[PDB]
Amino acid sequence: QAVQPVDFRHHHFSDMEIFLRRYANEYPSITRLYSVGKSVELRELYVMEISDNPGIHEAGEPEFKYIGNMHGNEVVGRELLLNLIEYLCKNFGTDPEVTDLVQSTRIHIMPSMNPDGYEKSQEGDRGGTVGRNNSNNYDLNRNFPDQFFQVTDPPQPETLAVMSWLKTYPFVLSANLHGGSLVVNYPFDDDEQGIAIYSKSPDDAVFQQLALSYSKENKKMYQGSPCKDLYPTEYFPHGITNGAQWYNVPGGMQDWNYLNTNCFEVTIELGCVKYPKAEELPKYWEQNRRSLLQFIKQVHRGIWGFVLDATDGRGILNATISVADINHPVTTYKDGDYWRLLVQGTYKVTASARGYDPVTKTVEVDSKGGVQVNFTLSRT
Ligand SMILES: *[C@@H]1O[C@H](CO)[C@@H](O[C@@H]2O[C@H](CO)[C@@H](O[C@@H]3O[C@H](CO)[C@@H](O)[C@H](O)[C@@H]3O)[C@H](O)[C@H]2NC(C)=O)[C@H](O)[C@H]1NC(C)=O
Numbered sequence: 571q572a573v574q575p576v577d578f579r580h581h582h583f584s585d586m587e588i589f590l591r592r593y594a595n596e597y598p599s600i601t602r603l604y605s606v607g608k609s610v611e612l613r614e615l616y617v618m619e620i621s622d623n624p625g626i627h628e629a630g631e632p633e634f635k636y637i638g639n640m641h642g643n644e645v646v647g648r649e650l651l652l653n654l655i656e657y658l659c660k661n662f663g664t665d666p667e668v669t670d671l672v673q674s675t676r677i678h679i680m681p682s683m684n685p686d687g688y689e690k691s692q693e694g695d696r697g698g699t700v701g702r703n704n705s706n707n708y709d710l711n712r713n714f715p716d717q718f719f720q721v722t723d724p725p726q727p728e729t730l731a732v733m734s735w736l737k738t739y740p741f742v743l744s745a746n747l748h749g750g751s752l753v754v755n756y757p758f759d760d761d762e763q764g765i766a767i768y769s770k771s772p773d774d775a776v777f778q779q780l781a782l783s784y785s786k787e788n789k790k791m792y793q794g795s796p797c798k799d800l801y802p803t804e805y806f807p808h809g810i811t812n813g814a815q816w817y818n819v820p821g822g823m824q825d826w827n828y829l830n831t832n833c834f835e836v837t838i839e840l841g842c843v844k845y846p847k848a849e850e851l852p853k854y855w856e857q858n859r860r861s862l863l864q865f866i867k868q869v870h871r872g873i874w875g876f877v878l879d880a881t882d883g884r885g886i887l888n889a890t891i892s893v894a895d896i897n898h899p900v901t902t903y904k905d906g907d908y909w910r911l912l913v914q915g916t917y918k919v920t921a922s923a924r925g926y927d928p929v930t931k932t933v934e935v936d937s938k939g940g941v942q943v944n945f946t947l948s949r950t
């Protein structure tokens with residue numbers, strides 16, 4: 571009964587800009603179109619914010635984000651996110667799922683992180699590299715500071731704009747879209763040895779559940795065989811894979827997220843054909859709609875709440891949330907609010923902060939959703 575997208579076709583920059591503006595102009599109450607910077611060839615890195623309170627962070631409200639077309643010729647992601655912009659705007663108010671989603675989450679959608687590369691891409695290209703890098707011929711997904719390999723390529727304008735953007739909002743969950751395979755890729759993307767081996771992150775548990783939440787809804791992806799005749803060597807149990815194990819990739823945007831912010835980012839491969847003919851687009855939406863939707867909901871799982879000041883009674887900014895045996899702490903935002911993605915289990919969470927006395931609580935996360943837990947810390 572929900573309204574499906576109708577605008578199925580490839581959108582070159584000009585038309586994407588026209589497209590985005592259309593929704594921002596037609597649904598001003600639940601949208602906010604903004605730019606986070608420009609590409610080498612001066613194209614806007616547009617982001618579409620969608621929520622019932624566009625332009626403001628609401629205390630306790632999770633910041634989510636989708637990013638596509640980081641590699642110019644991997645187009646499916648770009649179109650799906652445009653399809654998603656449409657689906658969300660057109661269904662808000664009439665569709666209970668979309669309404670409830672847009673009201674409880676602040677969704678940021680960037681259709682193309684490499685618009686210059688896109689323009690240099692050839693429709694029909696299945697596995698080529700023309701249009702992949704940015705205007706200066708650098709791989710944006712090799713451009714981020716890496717925890718193991720020492721990155722040499724000069725930081726590009728698209729990379730910088732995005733790093734800034736990631737520092738701007740309290741992003742909790744994220745996913746950047748690619749093409750060239752069919753699987754959801756999770757951290758870490760590389761290892762100290764720089765080879766194809768499993769590279770576990772402190773949050774390996776959640777990442778597998780987060781990745782599975784998407785692949786499970788994409789029937790063909792879940793089957794585990796991206797394209798038996800094109801890349802016969804590829805087999806991903808249940809449609810997910812640790813980055814490094816598939817193959818070593820240093821300088822990725824995915825790991826940079828986890829290691830430099832509170833955001834947990836996953837990389838999604840939407841299909842073996844990088845730049846399919848426009849006639850195939852509607853099928854990709856049909857096969858990923860439920861996935862795109864279910865993934866966003868994962869942002870509401872785990873634990874969340876506030877770290878307040880016993881005297882003031884108001885949130886503490888930049889407080890820390892440490893969990894049982896997971897060496898990856900999370901920080902609080904301006905209203906002392908935090909979100910910590912965790913798998914079903916029991917944890918010993920500890921809120922702490924400069925100038926206050928730490929509190930520890932035994933929290934319990936279930937298989938269904940998120941539990942609210944606040945921490946009131948006394949001063950020192
Ligand atoms: C897209 O941009 C990336 C850079 O971000 C290009 O990859 C880089 O390609 C150069 C040339 O192949 C590589 O340098 C060479 O490395 C080998 C291996 O050590 C060395 O023997 C050569 O003397 C030379 O230094 C470089 O390693 C590689 N960098 C990365 C991050 O992969 C890529 O070629 C670009 N794509 C296209 C189609 O131009």
Ligand SMILES: *[C@H]1O[C@H](CO)[C@@H](O[C@@H]2O[C@H](CO)[C@@H](O)[C@H](O)[C@H]2NC(C)=O)[C@H](O)[C@H]1NC(C)=O
Nearest residue numbers: 628629630875876877878883905942943944945
């Ligand atoms: C823990 O702290 C939060 C932050 O104040 C509490 O949320 C407030 O709840 C009261 C009463 O329900 C409201 O008047 C405030 O507007 C809420 N603040 C928000 C959501 O911004 C929360 O109820 C407290 N207790 C827990 C653990 O839920």
Ligand SMILES: N=C(N)NCCS[C@@H](CC(=O)O)C(=O)O
Nearest residue numbers: 711748755759813814816817819
């Ligand atoms: N960590 C690994 N091995 N893969 C993650 C997907 S990014 C990869 C594939 C893509 O470009 O789509 C790339 O950087 O080229």
Ligand SMILES: *[C@@H]1O[C@H](CO)[C@@H](O)[C@H](O)[C@H]1NC(C)=O
Nearest residue numbers: 887888889890899900901924
């Ligand atoms: C925020 O907290 C971190 C520790 O988690 C600290 O290193 C950093 O300096 C703090 N930022 C501020 C408020 O200066």
Ligand SMILES: [Zn+2]
Nearest residue numbers: 641644748749
């Ligand atoms: Zn890619």
